[PDB]
Structure formats: C-alpha cells, structure tokens
Amino acid sequence: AAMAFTLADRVTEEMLADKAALVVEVVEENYHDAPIVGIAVVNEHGRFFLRPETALADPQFVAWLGDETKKKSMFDSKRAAVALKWKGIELCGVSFDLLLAAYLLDPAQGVDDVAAAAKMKQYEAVRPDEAVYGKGAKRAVPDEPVLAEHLVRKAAAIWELERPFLDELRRNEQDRLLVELEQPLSSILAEMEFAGVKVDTKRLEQMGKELAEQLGTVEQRIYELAGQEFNINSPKQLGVILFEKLQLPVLKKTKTGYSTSADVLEKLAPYHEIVENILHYRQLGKLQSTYIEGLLKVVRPDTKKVHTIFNQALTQTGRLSSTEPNLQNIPIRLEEGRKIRQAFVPSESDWLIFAADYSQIELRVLAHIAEDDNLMEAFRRDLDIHTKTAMDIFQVSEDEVTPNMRRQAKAVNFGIVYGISDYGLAQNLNISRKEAAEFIERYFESFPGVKRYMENIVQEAKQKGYVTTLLHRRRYLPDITSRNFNVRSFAERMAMNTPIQGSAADIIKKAMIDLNARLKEERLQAHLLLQVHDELILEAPKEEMERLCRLVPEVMEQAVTLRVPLKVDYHYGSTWYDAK
DNA sequence: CCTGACTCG
DNA sequence: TGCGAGTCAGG
Numbered sequence A: 001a002a003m004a005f006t007l008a009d010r011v012t013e014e015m016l017a018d019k020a021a022l023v024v025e026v027v028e029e030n031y032h033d034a035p036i037v038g039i040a041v042v043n044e045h046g047r048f049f050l051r052p053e054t055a056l057a058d059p060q061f062v063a064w065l066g067d068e069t070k071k072k073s074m075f076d077s078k079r080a081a082v083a084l085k086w087k088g089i090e091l092c093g094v095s096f097d098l099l100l101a102a103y104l105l106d107p108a109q110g111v112d113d114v115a116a117a118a119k120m121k122q123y124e125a126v127r128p129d130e131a132v133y134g135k136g137a138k139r140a141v142p143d144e145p146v147l148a149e150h151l152v153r154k155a156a157a158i159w160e161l162e163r164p165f166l167d168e169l170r171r172n173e174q175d176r177l178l179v180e181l182e183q184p185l186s187s188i189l190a191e192m193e194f195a196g197v198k199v200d201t202k203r204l205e206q207m208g209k210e211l212a213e214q215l216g217t218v219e220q221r222i223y224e225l226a227g228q229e230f231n232i233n234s235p236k237q238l239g240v241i242l243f244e245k246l247q248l249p250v251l252k253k254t255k256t257g258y259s260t261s262a263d264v265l266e267k268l269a270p271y272h273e274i275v276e277n278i279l280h281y282r283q284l285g286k287l288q289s290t291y292i293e294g295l296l297k298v299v300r301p302d303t304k305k306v307h308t309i310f311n312q313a314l315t316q317t318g319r320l321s322s323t324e325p326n327l328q329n330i331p332i333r334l335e336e337g338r339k340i341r342q343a344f345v346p347s348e349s350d351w352l353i354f355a356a357d358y359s360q361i362e363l364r365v366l367a368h369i370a371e372d373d374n375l376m377e378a379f380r381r382d383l384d385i386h387t388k389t390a391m392d393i394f395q396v397s398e399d400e401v402t403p404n405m406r407r408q409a410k411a412v413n414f415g416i417v418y419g420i421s422d423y424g425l426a427q428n429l430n431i432s433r434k435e436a437a438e439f440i441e442r443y444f445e446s447f448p449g450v451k452r453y454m455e456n457i458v459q460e461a462k463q464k465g466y467v468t469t470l471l472h473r474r475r476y477l478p479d480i481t482s483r484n485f486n487v488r489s490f491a492e493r494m495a496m497n498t499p500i501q502g503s504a505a506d507i508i509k510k511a512m513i514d515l516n517a518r519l520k521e522e523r524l525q526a527h528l529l530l531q532v533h534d535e536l537i538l539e540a541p542k543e544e545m546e547r548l549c550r551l552v553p554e555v556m557e558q559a560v561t562l563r564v565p566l567k568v569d570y571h572y573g574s575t576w577y578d579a580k
Numbered sequence B: 001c002c003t004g005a006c007t008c009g
Numbered sequence C: 001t002g003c004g005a006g007t008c009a010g011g
C-alpha cells in the first residue's frame, strides 16, 4: 500500500514538536559540501515532507534544528550534521542514531541504510536506498513523488524502531555505549571532518616531480636487468619475467599464475639484483599513484584542505575507518614515504601540528584483562615490553638480549595480540611451525595469566556466543562452534583479539570526548584533526603548545582506569612530518 | 567489478 | 591463518 504524509509547501508549527524522527537526505556518498535533496519529519502530529530550499530558508525550522531541547531521532546523523555545517546550519538535539544503534547491536550485519536496520526487527515497510537511488552510473535522485515517500518511510521506520532498539541495547548493557560514547563522538567526528586538514600542494607537486625522476631511473634499471621492457605493475607480466625469463625459484603458488608478493620477493632478493629494484619501484610507485596524484585529486581546489569521512559504523572491533582520502594510512615506516607528511600543515599561520599516541595500548589492555602478574608488573615498571618478553622466553638477562632476540620476541607479542597460532607466527618469522610452537610455549610459561585468558575467552565465546570489550561493545562469533578447523580457528583468534583491539578503541574514543570537553572548558583554539587508532592529531596556535603538552596526555591517560597505567607520548612541529 | 599489490595501527 | 582497515593499476 502507500504511507500517508503531507507534502508541505511551507513549515508549520506542528512540524516543530520537541520529539521527532528527522531525515535530512544527502544522496552523494561523500556528503562534504553536498546537496540535501529532501527533508522528512515524523512526530506525534503526523508525517511531513519538506523541500530543502523551503525548510532550510525558514528561520523557524533552522532554529528548531539548532535547539538542543528539541529531540531528533535519525539514521547517520553525522552525514546530516556535516552537510548542514557546510551550509552554516547547526544541528543539535540528536538523541538517537539508528545507524549507531544497529552497529552496536551487531557490527557484522553491515547495516548501511534504514531498511537494513529495520529488517533486524522484522520491519520491512521501507525500501533499501540502493533500490530507490540505484548504484554507480545509474545513481540518481528520483522524482519528488518517489523521493518523498521514501524519506517519509525512512522517518517512520526510525520513529517506530527507536524504542525496540533502545530496549535491546539496554538488555545488552550497551545503552550508555550508544548515548554516552558513540553519539557524542559522532558530533566530534563531524567537527573534525568539517575542519579538514590543510595540504601544501606545492610541496606535494615538487615531491611528485622528484619521485617521477627516481621512478624513471629504477624503471629503466629494471628493464636493463630483465633484458626487456614490461609492465612492472602487472603481477602477471612480472611473474613471467621472474620465474620464466630469469628462472627465479618458485616458492609460492597463489590463486592464478605465480605470486610476487612482498615476502615472496624478499626471499628471492638474494638470487637476482632485479628483485630489490622491483620492490623499490613498487614502493615509490605507490607513493606517486596514491599519496601524490591520488591525494591531489581530493584536495579542495579553493581551501587546499582534504576532508576525510570517518566511518563510525563499519569495523568489527569498534575502530573507525577513514576514506576519500584515508588519512589513517599515510606513509611513515620508510623515510622516503614519510616525507609525504611534510605536505600536511596547520590550517592557519603561526599554528602547529600536535600528535599524542598511546604507548603499547594493546599489550597494556591485555595485561589488564588477563590480569597476568608478570605482564602487569612489566608495565608498572614501564619496561621496554619487547626486551622484557625476550628476557623471559629466551631466559636471558637484559644485557644478554640481542637485537635479533628482541625482534623475534616482538613478533611473538604481535602473535599473542592477534590470536597466537603456530602457522601464523612461523610465517611471519619465517621459521618452522615446531619452532614457532616452542616460542609460544615459552611465552605462556612466562605469562600464565595470558594463557589462562586465551583459554577462557574462547570458552566464553562458545558459551555466550559473543565476546565483549571494556565498554560493552560486542562481537558475535558463531563460527566458534564450527567443526571445520580453519573456520573455527579464525573465530578463536577473533575471540582473543577483539576484546583487546576493541577495548583499545573504546578507550581512545572516550579520550576524544573527554579532551573536547576540556578544550572547550579552557576555551583553547586547539582542535582535533584526526584519530589514527591509538593516536590523536590536533592543530593549534604555537602559543598553546605548552598547555597541550600537559593537557592532552593527561586526558588520554586518564580516560579509563586499568590495573596498569596508560602511557602517552607526544610531539609537535611545523608539519605532520615534524610532529615526531 | 576482481585481484594483487601497496599503505597504516 | 597470525588482528583490524583503504586505494589503485592491471586484468
């Protein structure tokens, strides 16, 4: 059938009730400076559709949007909030966000539209956005009749679904997780995205020129060593050259043809001088295509800023992700790529970039949750955790720990956090499974509490059907009971890792909320720009650095109280590169 | 659109 | 098979 609603030509009093489901539709996937195609409001008085030009030009409606005492229930309120920010309109009073509610209830559902969330509660009186707008080249806003009913149906679904979603959240002990963590964070992410990060495009272009030169040199050096020209960026063409023309050993047979992955070539390097060059070529090639050309493509022509979008409802562990561009994967590990960060600068003159990061948050969280005496003491002494681990598993004094020993102990710690497995560790350290198993046994002997936790968390996952984080985020693991070893093992590793990675995510999210409250209380001009999993990047007047050096670490370190202290390091400088 | 390469915590 | 993510050239 059809859903009744008023297609209003002007805003009316009854459309401004103090409780309503609100839809401010932005169809463009990237909502920055994007158009709002329509508005829908559902409240105690009825269902309404408003043309944006009319609603957003009405002083009464705008005041309503900005009145924190007028409560709104929405789906992906950040999208609407940011689209409105670009129009100079403030959105306040969002008391419920269906996207975040659904995400917390079950991140694996992949809910990305009202229909998907409603289907969770057997409500299907609303169409999927894709069905209405289509996808790809066929994407398009339907005629008003169609658009209007869709927005109203979405608003009606939100209106109806709020109660049941909140009820289940409460049963899961996630009510505060939504109301006191994710929703307030949503508003903070909106400010960060809207603020954007300034890019020194002239610096990027010059780096681009220099890379084009080096890339040319390496490219020619590769054709020279191969005795012919070919597409180096073609794993297929590359494979023929390496394993056929040059007769290099085939140590890995992937899906189709051969494998020319990083660790495969790293092992082939000793056989021919071409391998090193191919690796370097790929390194520089990625910098050019993605961090030079790709980045320049998304920099706003006028402001020279990039405005990422933090997807707050995607990862299975509670982390955020970043896109167009992804500002959470800018090079830093290799010096040549790290230079890219010199192109990220403060948005105002005489300002600086300030970066604060948690030191070993994952292992500190593990110590807390597993309550391992040895691991908690290590952090209480603020020891170099990898050196300490080597001392324990290899039974040597601190002075006897060699560089190679620390390296392997470090790999063991990663394995432990990721969900330790003979095969996995062996593959990473390039050693036998038995040897890797020996390392693992030694680790558990030194950290019996961690062994206990890994055993218990897997059992708990099987009993309850899910695992939880410090702030009650959850992840269902049905595969934990699979009689297929490989499938079950994936689930077991997830049971071990999710509480760690997820809890670390919970912590920094609270740190961000606490920090913004502090910045506001102090009326500092400093503001957050980015979050990179265990670090927070801000920009501020140079005159605020001394205050930031004390405030940021303290806030981050005190976000939550664990059985071991939380440690935060920080640096600042003229560019992101210099904030080291 | 899919694969395999690279980037990050 | 070690955990969690995104982007791009070639197929």
Ligand SMILES: OC[C@H]1O[C@@](CO)(O[C@H]2O[C@H](CO)[C@@H](O)[C@H](O)[C@H]2O)[C@@H](O)[C@@H]1O
Pocket (backbone or CB within 6 Å): A029, A030, A031, A076, A079, A111, A112, A113, A309, A310, A311, A312, A313, A314, A323
């Ligand atoms: O507004 C972000 C919000 O929208 C979703 C859809 O529910 O993702 C859309 O927007 C992202 C940023 O432009 C795209 O990467 C994604 O492809 C598009 O569907 C959510 O995942 C997200 O929380």
Ligand SMILES: [Mg+2]
Pocket (backbone or CB within 6 Å): A357, A358, A359, A360, A534
């Ligand atoms: Mg760190």
